[PDB]
Design a protein around this ligand. Structure first.
Ligand code: J58
Length: 111
């Protein structure tokens, strides 16, 4: 069984974000070839995406919830590093990130 907090990351945070209309670009690792993203892996050192986060939760990978939160922070920040303020993907990430913050502020205590 996962920690209370990791269950919350899976059943509240990921479940909510996955269903959001803007989440789909984040469902799998950025494929820099398919997306024609020059030098993506030269500038983004630690790729992350919500499909990987969801798999890590399903597959019992994390030891504690802060590791999962760090993966979300990496995912969002990578989007901002690579893209300029007016890009649609930045607006999409910003909406998801606000929800992420609102939800992790309500993370439960372990008991
Ligand atoms: N980190 C990044 C940067 C640019 C992107 N375009 N589309 C997706 Br999904 C992206 C993710």
């Amino acid at each position: 069984r996962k920690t209370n907090q990791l269950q919350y990351m899976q059943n509240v945070v990921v479940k909510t974000l996955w269903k959001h209309q803007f989440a789909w670009p984040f469902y799998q690792p950025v494929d820099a070839i398919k997306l024609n993203l020059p030098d993506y892996h030269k500038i983004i050192k630690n790729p992350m995406d919500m499909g990987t986060i969801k798999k890590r939760l399903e597959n019992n990978y994390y030891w504690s919830a802060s590791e999962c939160m760090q993966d979300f922070n990496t995912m969002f920040t990578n989007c901002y590093i690579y893209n300029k303020p007016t890009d649609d993907i930045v607006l999409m990430a910003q909406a998801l990130e606000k929800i992420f913050l609102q939800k992790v502020a309500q993370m439960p205590q372990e008991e």
